[PDB]
């Protein structure tokens, strides 16, 4: 029958490893780098656009930064199509939580659910896993600013600063080298751009190859705000930090 063509995407290796998960991570490693840095007064998300052109319409483009909630966002590394599938269920999950409890969904709760979904494709169904890794940046009143990361396995962990995608090792070393618990959003914004700049496989780090986002509590208000920078906004910040 069919058994002949079954790849068996959900089995252990003799070393107790999950093949497909490993291979999916192997796929992620070649994806545009995405960085998440959390400060005392906010969080920063920055990703490098993989494959670009003169003709690519950047104003209408989004391939790495997605808004999930008004207080939560994610940076993607891997198959964009696979991510959109997960993203959309995450958006529904947040609204379900809100509808049920009349309170915005706590950041970890959203992350755990999404991770559980990935985990499933790992233990049953004979389907391939999603080739995606997420960096979650969000804020809630129980833990304030939070930074999470989930990968194909369905496991997730919290970070002060982190990267996913390509050249993560180099990027992690550079972050673990200049990160300081008492950083300020703007400090993080600069550390983020500098890291990408040194890891980039490209010639120069221009605005047209980046997506940026911040979650800050604009003092003159009292509420938290998500801001997914526009092409010009990135072009500006890029000149300021000294990368012109």
């Amino acid at each position: 029958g069919s058994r002949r063509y079954d790849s068996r995407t959900t089995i252990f290796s003799p070393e107790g490893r999950l093949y497909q998960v490993e291979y999916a991570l192997e796929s992620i490693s070649h994806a545009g780098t995405a960085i998440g840095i959390m400060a005392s007064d906010g969080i920063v998300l920055a990703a490098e656009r993989k494959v670009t052109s003169t003709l690519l319409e950047q104003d209408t483009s989004t391939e790495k930064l997605y808004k999930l909630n008004d207080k939560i966002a994610v940076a993607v590394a891997g198959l964009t199509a696979d991510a959109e599938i997960l993203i959309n269920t995450a958006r529904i999950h947040a609204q379900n939580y809100l509808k049920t409890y009349n309170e915005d969904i706590p950041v970890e709760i959203l992350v755990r659910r999404l991770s559980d979904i990935k985990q499933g494709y790992t233990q049953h169904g004979g389907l391939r896993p999603f080739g995606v890794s997420f960096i979650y940046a969000g804020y809630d009143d129980r833990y304030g600013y939070q930074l999470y990361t989930s990968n194909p396995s369905g496991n997730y962990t919290g970070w002060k600063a982190i990267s996913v995608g390509a050249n993560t090792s180099a990027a992690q070393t550079l972050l673990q080298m200049d990160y300081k618990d008492d950083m300020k959003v703007d400090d993080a914004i600069e550390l983020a751009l500098k890291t990408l700049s040194k890891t980039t496989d490209s010639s120069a780090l221009t605005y047209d190859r980046l997506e940026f986002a911040t979650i800050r509590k604009g003092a003159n208000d009292g509420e938290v705000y998500q801001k997914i920078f526009k092409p010009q906004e990135i072009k500006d910040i890029l000149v300021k930090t000294g990368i012109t």
Partner: protein
């Protein structure tokens, strides 16, 4: 629709997927539990492949199934969440139908059954997880400690460890734990636990987390300091010789 038999017998009578599931456990961070005369302690090691995490939000290794029972594990993290959720759900259900919280042995038997079921059900792989479940039965003061593995087998221990270098830490415990006189104190119980972990953690104050469970739903996890202190008083035990 997917129902392929993934766990099956091979010529020598082994279920390789279950065995490889243990290999996943062997690779997991170490976990240990020792029962005193009036408490049980659970300690886990924290990896260091990457350090720059936010320890506040990053999920811990010791989970409360109910207010009087906790569970720790070694193996795939994603897999453990599933077992923990099911156990928690069952704990609430048992309280509802029997009008009494689960006994540690009952909760253990349930978790083990879930694992066994995943070793002979089509379309699924076994859990790459071994657990340590501990607490005090309702209105009982006798400490309880059990361990479960992928196969679905479980049993109680005076003290036990799982995960990487668990071979080492067990030796330490076999020749450092006396059933005749179990750590009669919460403090001396936590010491023996931190000692057993240091045999493999290799100086890791922030790489060692302990959680103490006392009778009548008294559960609390020590902080880096309380722990760091134990580590301190122990490195002197060595040097003072």
């Amino acid at each position: 629709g997917y129902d392929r038999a993934l766990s099956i017998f091979s010529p020598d009578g082994h279920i390789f997927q279950v065995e490889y599931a243990l290999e996943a456990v062997k690779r997991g961070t170490c976990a240990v539990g020792v029962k005193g005369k009036n408490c049980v302690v659970l300690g886990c090691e924290r990896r260091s492949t990457l350090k720059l995490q936010d320890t506040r939000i990053t999920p811990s290794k010791v989970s409360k199934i109910d207010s009087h029972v906790v569970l720790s594990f070694s193996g795939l993290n994603a897999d453990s969440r599933i077992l923990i959720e099911k156990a928690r759900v069952e704990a609430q259900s048992h309280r509802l139908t029997l009008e009494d919280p689960v006994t540690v042995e009952y909760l253990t038997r349930y978790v083990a059954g879930v694992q066994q079921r995943y070793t002979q059900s089509g379309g699924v792989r076994p859990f790459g997880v071994s657990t340590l479940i501990a607490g005090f039965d309702p209105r009982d003061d006798e400490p309880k400690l059990y361990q479960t593995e992928p196969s679905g087998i479980y049993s109680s221990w005076s003290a036990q460890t799982i995960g990487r270098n668990s071979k080492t830490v067990r030796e330490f415990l076999e020749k450092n734990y006396d059933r005749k006189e179990p750590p009669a104190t919460v403090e001396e119980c936590v010491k023996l636990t931190v000692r057993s972990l240091l045999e493999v953690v290799q100086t890791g104050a922030k790489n060692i987390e302990i959680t103490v469970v006392k009778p009548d739903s008294d559960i609390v996890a020590l902080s880096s300091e309380e722990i760091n202190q134990y580590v301190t008083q122990i490195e002197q035990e060595k040097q003072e010789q």
